[PDB]
Write a protein that binds this ligand. Structure first.
Ligand SMILES: CCCCCCCCCCC(CCCCCCCCCC)(CO[C@@H]1O[C@H](CO)[C@@H](O[C@H]2O[C@H](CO)[C@@H](O)[C@H](O)[C@H]2O)[C@H](O)[C@H]1O)CO[C@@H]1O[C@H](CO)[C@@H](O[C@H]2O[C@H](CO)[C@@H](O)[C@H](O)[C@H]2O)[C@H](O)[C@H]1O
Ligand SMILES: CCCCCCCCCCC(CCCCCCCCCC)(CO[C@@H]1O[C@H](CO)[C@@H](O[C@H]2O[C@H](CO)[C@@H](O)[C@H](O)[C@H]2O)[C@H](O)[C@H]1O)CO[C@@H]1O[C@H](CO)[C@@H](O[C@H]2O[C@H](CO)[C@@H](O)[C@H](O)[C@H]2O)[C@H](O)[C@H]1O
Ligand SMILES: CC(C)CCC[C@@H](C)[C@H]1CC[C@H]2[C@@H]3CC=C4C[C@@H](OC(=O)CCC(=O)O)CC[C@]4(C)[C@H]3CC[C@]12C
Ligand SMILES: [Zn+2]
Ligand SMILES: [Zn+2]
Ligand SMILES: [Zn+2]
Ligand SMILES: [Zn+2]
Ligand SMILES: [Zn+2]
Ligand SMILES: [Zn+2]
Ligand SMILES: [Zn+2]
Ligand SMILES: [Zn+2]
Lengths: 325, 323
C-alpha cells in the first residue's frame, strides 16, 4: 500500500527537478520560491511514508506496550496540523500581497510549471481516491488543497496573460493604484490592460481555496482529536452498554468503566464490576463477553470484584487525584 | 494572566502587521514566537477551564484531562510549521534579498518586545517555571534589536539619485534602464554583503535555537500522548516482579499506558491458581503495582490451557482485539 506514497514522492522529486531546471534556464527566483513551497508537500508525503512504515511494525516493543499502531493517527494529526499552519502562513502572505501588490513575470513558464504541478496532483489524487486509514484521507485532503491552489495560480496567470501590457518606461503602464518604485525616478526626471481587476483575482482565489481547504479538513481534525483523546466513537453508546450490562443477573454494580479506541475499529474497554459468588464466574464472564461482542467491543479487560465501598481495591492509603477520571 | 495574555496577543498582532509592512524576517520570527506563546497560554487556559469541573461525560468516560498535553503538542507542531515557513522565507531571501524601510520602527518594536518578555514571567511558580522561557524570549528579541541596529548604523541607501545602489541587489527596471545614463553619486553601499546578510543569518540562527529549545518538549509530548511506557517504569523489571507473585503463574495481554502527568493505567490478565479464594492475592498484586509508579490498577484475573486467553471471541479480534 506504500507504493502510492512512494510514487507520490517520486513525482514530487521530479517536479522539483523540472522546477529547478526551469529556474536555471529562465533565471527567475519565483520558480525557486515555488519549489520551496512544494517542499512542504514533499515533507508531508515523507511524514505519511514514515508513518506507514512504522505502522507496518506492530511487535509490541519494549517501550511501546500497545505497539506503534497509534503512530498512524498521530502522524495523521501532525500532517493535518502542518497543513493548517501552512494555510495560516498562506493567509498571512495573501493579506500582505493584498496590502502590497506584486505581479509576476514570464507568464509562459509560470503557466507551464503550474499545469505540470496540476497534472501531478491530479494523478496523485486519482490514485488516492481508492477509498480504512485516516492518514490516507489526510494526505488526500492535503493533495486536493494543493491542486486547488495550483489550478488557482494557473487561472490567475492565464487571465493575467490575456489582458496586460508590460512596459519598459517607454509607455506609462502601471496604474496609479500600483505604487511605482521611487515614482519611477520622478517620471524619469497606454496604461496597460487590466489595471486592477486582475490584481484582486489571485488574492480572492487563494483565500477561497484556503477557506475550502479548512472546511474540508475540519472533520478530519475533529475525527483525529476524538479518536486520539480517548473518546467513545460512533456506534457505541455508554448509556446503552451500561443498561445492557446492569440488567444482567451476574453483575451487581458497575464502576470505573473506561472505553478508548486504539486505531480505527480497534477499541478496548475496561470494566471494574462486582459479582456475587465465585461459582459460575465463567458463565457470567462468557455472557458479558458475548454482550460486548454484540456491540463494537471485541477486546476488553473486565475485572471481577468480590465482597457499600466504591471499590474493594484502591491505591495504598487515602491518596487521591491519581486514579483515572 | 488573562489581561497579560490579551496584551501579548495585541502586541503580537501589531508586530505581525509591522513585519508585513516592513518585510522584516527577524520581526516576523519574533511575532511567530509571540503567537506560539499566546496560543500556548490560550491552550493552558482552556485546559484549566475544562479541568475545573471535569467529570465522566458521555463523550469521554476517561475524562478530558489529556486536553492539556494534547493542546501543548498542537502548539508545538504549529510552532514547528511556522518555523519551517520562516525557514523557506529565509531561503527565498537568500535567493531574493530585500531591504527594510524603517529601522527605527523595528528597533522600537524590539525594545517593546524585550520589555513585554521581561514583564511576562515577573508575575511564585510562574517565575521559576518560565525563567528559561523569559531568557529565551529576551535573547530572541535582542537578536532582532541588534540586527536592526547594525542595519541602521552602517547601511547607506540610494534614496535619491546616486550610485550606491548595488547592481547585484534587485533594482527597479535595472535602475529604470539606467535612468541617469551617466556617472551618479558613488555613495557606496558600505559593505552590502556584510549588511544584507545580517538579517537572514540572524533569523536562521534564531529559528535554529527555537527548534533546539522546543524539540525536547516535542519528544516528551509525543511520548506522553502516543501510548508509551513512562520513563519512571521498566516493563521487563515490572513483569519479572509480577511473575514472582505466588498467585500468578503466567501473564498475557499486559498493557501499561499513562493518561497524563502522574496518572498511570495498568491492565493485567492473570490465569491464577485458585479462583475461589481471590483473597490475599488481589491486595498482593495491588501492592505490587503500587510500590511502582502505578496508582490506578485494572488487574482482571482469568479463572482456570493451550490458548493464551480462554475468554475470547471472533477472529476479528486479530484486527480488533489488542495484540
Ligand atoms: C511518524 C512519527 C514516529 C515517531 C516515533 C518514532 C520511533 C522511532 C524513533 C526512536 C524512539 C522514539 C523517539 C521519538 C522522537 C520524536 C520523533 C518525531 C515525532 C514527530 C514526527 C523509539 O525507540 C525505538 O523505536 C523503534 C520504532 O520502530 C523501535 O526499534 C526498532 O528500530 C527499527 C525500526 O525499523 C527496527 O529495525 C528494530 O528492530 C527495532 O528495535 C523501538 O521502539 C525503539 O528502539 C526513541 O525513543
Ligand atoms: C487551530 C485550530 C486547530 C483545531 C483545534 C481543535 C478543533 C476541534 C475541537 C474539538 C473538541 C475537542 C478539543 C477541546 C479543546 C482542546 C484544546 C484545543 C486547542 C486548540 C488551539 C472541542 O471541545 C468541545 O468544545 C466545546 C465548546 O463549546 C465544549 O463543549 C461544550 O458544549 C458541548 C455541546 O453542547 C457539550 O460537550 C457541553 O455543553 C460543553 O462541554 C468543550 O470544550 C468540548 O466539548 C470536541 O468537539 C466536540 O464537538 C462535538 C460536535 O460539535 C460536540 O459534542 C462537542 O463540541 C465536542 O464533543
Ligand atoms: C535542516 C533543518 C530542517 C533542521 C536543522 C537543525 C537540526 C539538524 C537539529 C536541530 C535539533 C537537533 C536534535 C536535538 C536533539 C537530539 C537528541 C539526540 O538524540 C537522542 O535522542 C539522544 C538523547 C537526547 O539527547 O535526547 C541527538 C539527535 C537530536 C534528535 C538532534 C538531531 C538534529 C536536530 C533535529
Ligand atoms: Zn500541500
Ligand atoms: Zn470480538
Ligand atoms: Zn470496585
Ligand atoms: Zn476512572
Ligand atoms: Zn516565548
Ligand atoms: Zn498508587
Ligand atoms: Zn486470558
Ligand atoms: Zn495486546
Amino acid at each position: 500500500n506504500r507504493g502510492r506514497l512512494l510514487c507520490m514522492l517520486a513525482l514530487t522529486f521530479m517536479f522539483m527537478v523540472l522546477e529547478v531546471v526551469v529556474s536555471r534556464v529562465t533565471s527567475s527566483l519565483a520558480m525557486l520560491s515555488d519549489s520551496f513551497h512544494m517542499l512542504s508537500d514533499v515533507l508531508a508525503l515523507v511524514v505519511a511514508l514514515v508513518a506507514e512504515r512504522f505502522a507496518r511494525r506492530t511487535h509490541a516493543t519494549q517501550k511501546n506496550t500497545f505497539g506503534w499502531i497509534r503512530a498512524e493517527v498521530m502522524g495523521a494529526l501532525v500532517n493535518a496540523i502542518f497543513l493548517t499552519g501552512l494555510c495560516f502562513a498562506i493567509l498571512l502572505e495573501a493579506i500582505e500581497r493584498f496590502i502590497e501588490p506584486h505581479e509576476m513575470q514570464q507568464p509562459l513558464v509560470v503557466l507551464g510549471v503550474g499545469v505540470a504541478g496540476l497534472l501531478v496532483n491530479v494523478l496523485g489524487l486519482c490514485l488516492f481516491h481508492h477509498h480504512g486509514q485516516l492518514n490516507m484521507r489526510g494526505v488526500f485532503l492535503h493533495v486536493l488543497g494543493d491542486a486547488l491552489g495550483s489550478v488557482i495560480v494557473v487561472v490567475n496567470a492565464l487571465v493575467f496573460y490575456f489582458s496586460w501590457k508590460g512596459c519598459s518606461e517607454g509607455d506609462f503602464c502601471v496604474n496609479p493604484c500600483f505604487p511605482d518604485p521611487c515614482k519611477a525616478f520622478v517620471e524619469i526626471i497606454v496604461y496597460e490592460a487590466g489595471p486592477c481587476w486582475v490584481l484582486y483575482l489571485d488574492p480572492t482565489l487563494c483565500v477561497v481555496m484556503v477557506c475550502i481547504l479548512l472546511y474540508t479538513t475540519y472533520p478530519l481534525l475533529k475525527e483525529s482529536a476524538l479518536i486520539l483523546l480517548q473518546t467513545v466513537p460512533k456506534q457505541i453508546d455508554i448509556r446503552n452498554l451500561i443498561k445492557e450490562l446492569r440488567n444482567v443477573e451476574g453483575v451487581e454494580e458497575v464502576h470505573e468503566l473506561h472505553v478508548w479506541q486504539l486505531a480505527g475499529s480497534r477499541i478496548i474497554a475496561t470494566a471494574h464490576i462486582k459479582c456475587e459468588d465465585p461459582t459460575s464466574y465463567m458463565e457470567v464472564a462468557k455472557t458479558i463477553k458475548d454482550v460486548f461482542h454484540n456491540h463494537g467491543i471485541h477486546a476488553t479487560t473486565i475485572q471481577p470484584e468480590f465482597a457499600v465501598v466504591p471499590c474493594e481495591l484502591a491505591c495504598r492509603t487515602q491518596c487521591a487525584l491519581k486514579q483515572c477520571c
